[PDB]
Please model this.
Amino acid sequence: CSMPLGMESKAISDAQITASSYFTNMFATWSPSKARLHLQGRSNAWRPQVNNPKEWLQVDFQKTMKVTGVTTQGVKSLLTSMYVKEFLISSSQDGHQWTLFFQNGKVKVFQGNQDSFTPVVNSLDPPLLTRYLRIHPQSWVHQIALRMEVLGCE
Amino acid sequence: IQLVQSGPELKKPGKTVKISCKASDYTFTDYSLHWVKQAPGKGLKWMGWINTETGDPAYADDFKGRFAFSLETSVRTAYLQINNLKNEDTAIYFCAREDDGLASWGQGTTLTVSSAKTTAPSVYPLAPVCGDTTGSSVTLGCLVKGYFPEPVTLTWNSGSLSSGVHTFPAVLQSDLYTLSSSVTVTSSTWPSQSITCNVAHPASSTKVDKKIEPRGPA
Amino acid sequence: QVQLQQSGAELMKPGASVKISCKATGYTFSSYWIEWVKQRPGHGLEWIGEILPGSGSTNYNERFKGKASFTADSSSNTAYMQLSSLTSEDSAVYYCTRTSYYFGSSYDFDVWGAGTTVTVSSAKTTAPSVYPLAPVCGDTTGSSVTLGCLVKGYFPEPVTLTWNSGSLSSGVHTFPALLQSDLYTLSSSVTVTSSTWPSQSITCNVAHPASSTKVDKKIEPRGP
Amino acid sequence: QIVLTQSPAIMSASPGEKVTMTCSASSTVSYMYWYQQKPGSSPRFLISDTSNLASGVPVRFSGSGSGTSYSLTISRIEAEDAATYYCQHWSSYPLTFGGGTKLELKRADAAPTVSIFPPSSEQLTSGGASVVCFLNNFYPKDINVKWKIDGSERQNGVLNSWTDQDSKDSTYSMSSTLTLTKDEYERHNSYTCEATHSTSPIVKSFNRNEC
Amino acid sequence: DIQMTQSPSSLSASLGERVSLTCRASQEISGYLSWLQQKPDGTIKRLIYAASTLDSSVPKRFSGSRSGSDYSLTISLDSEDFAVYYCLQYASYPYTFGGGTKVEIKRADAAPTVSIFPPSSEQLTSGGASVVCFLNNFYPKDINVKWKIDGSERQNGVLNSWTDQDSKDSTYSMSSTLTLTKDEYERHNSYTCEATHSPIVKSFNRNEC
Model:
């Protein structure tokens, strides 16, 4: 039960992916819907408007799914590699009330990436039953930048 | 940054064809590559895409089975292979580079799936009898008759004559194709200057140059 | 009813350490960052750092790296900040507050603790003496009379003072304490009508927790 | 799963006019893309991300829209704008094109320039005879061609072919070919090609015997 | 670190008057700014979050805005609104506050009510003598006290303390204490307290009412 839910394939549409904010200027728009694993082109990742531990990227499955893992990736803009080292994960059924992913009575801090190109697969044990998913970058290199994939089934 | 596709293809049904798409520079591995089908007279239909950094192909629903996208990064080339060809595979196939939209398109590849054999075209010159003029102008022409498959390429004076040219879509006559082109120039430029139509038929490796010249009545 | 209850005032000698607490009620303790903030007397606010009790994750302002350390006891829903090797620069009021772990809510810095006063000094804890203040011979000043209490020679802060157990609150001025030779001195003023006093009782209620002192000084007219 | 609808399929317009082509999505998309395609050509990128002009695109082109409603507008129509226009999204699987909108240009009526051509001696030696007639640059597409041999109408053995709207003058052209065996061709002397829209034809002829 | 500069840092306005405070971030903070109110008792209240969103338990006369990169708190004024206001930046770490703006209420001038008090028996018995003078309900805050013993000005031994602006009155108050030993206190008879805001004097004698 570790099938891509549609981040890379775009089975999860752009409108399903949202964030706390995103970085936009004259030349680049690092929109939330660009947070798709292995995405190509320019500005090929999500970046929040500012770098703090309270920024989040949201995926609405529009349907309760069984999430058994997430895969994360950074990105390299020119000479600057950008990626998140650690993150939290929260979920919701209505998209308004949120709950952090606890493990062994303690809120789990997942270990993310060490570079801008290698995907890192983090396991979600116990598996998550949720319609909404949120990822919360806690520490990062250079800038918060994210391409991801959700793994599981229905 | 350009995309150059291979040449036209004629294949018997049930066989295999491999269409290439070559990029003008190595930056093509920073962009995704899409494939599009344009059936005869139809619109644009997406076949899927391939990640050029990863090599992973993704296929549209209608194209899961006999279709394969591959890659050779060393020669900046993407490929589209179609196995077990059907008649319905007859169409034009485009590759396109993704960059906030399909920003670069190949010239297209014409695929014909038929059991029929190749027939090279006859090429006849069209000139008014005795070079009789039509006022200050004169219309010449070129007839390309009895060929298969499509396409043929036709130019006037190696493509240097483009204004006042009408090239008519081929018609079945009635198992083969027939085509014609007209060119209109000033009566002072002909036959004083030379006018030649150039007919290329790839499938038969045909290249014919036909100089248009005035002739007595026939 | 989201509230944050902070610890009482504290006194420690320089070079030593103090551990002040922030108790939370009215919400899920584990899923909000507890913030800690410093204020030097007379100066502005300074951000020390934060802790996420649910995970025990911390973020420190670089300035306080070696000075401050955060912990959290989720069984009692209480966060703690320990300050190490105290200097006089560490004498301040310390506030705790709260932020959501995700942006977009109404919870960022919404509720603040009342603050905890930290005093760094080697001075001894001294109980105050409370002295009545009355015009000589109860000499009247028009249709009114101002009375008072003098709370002298205590350490450390704070002291509490009421008039008639709090029932007299109008026309009361309590002045900030003043420090001299390791001792504090505080006064409070109360104004009533000439008919009120001395015909009716006016009493000074003083308490000094640190020395467990509680006095009720009644104000009486006195010869010269 | 998002579907794109362009309406109408075909849209007529005079040069200089302002035309707006619409593309409605069954569901929200992030950006709409637009393409231009002419017969025999590869699609040409017009609009990136709903409203950005692609490289080399004239400023008379503009894109707009949001949510499920998007449009492409040409401020002042040029004759070279006769083409098929496609919208496209890539917000979800699968990437999808609109059905296309064909833009046809209105212009004044024009009589065809008619030219007739005898068979080449080359073809005759081969045993065949194709008489060719070009009816060029007329408007609208309403031309009938009639063939006559020695003055008598001939209906069998004729093949016709039409060009689409010309990029310069917005006219149409037609090519008509009468095919005969060399033998039936040499049994007559005069060959005639007639063009009719009205009541009066345009006629071109040649003789086998003289210029 | 992102530096927050508040202006004017010190402000004095009348009741009903419209006021405005300004924070300028040294970097882009993208509307991640809070406005805080601190009362003299030390209480801190959140007024504004995310640049311009009112705290639900805060009067509608408070509002926030911003013209990059200048953020503004505006009060359209109450006697309860005297406080020190801080801006708080939370776009990136470490969090940084503005320097603060002290808002004082302007009111009509007022002379202090002066009251003088002799040492109590209890204090004298313990060898000390504190003479106390209250200067109540005056405006503006600037004021002088002079002490005299037997008609002579006394400088050493005086300690002063000011209250902050009164909540529902807007005046200031001040306590002045002259401390002497019991021994020196009893070598004299008259004690005087003078206030300068010409002088306002209050005194007592040890020998009579």
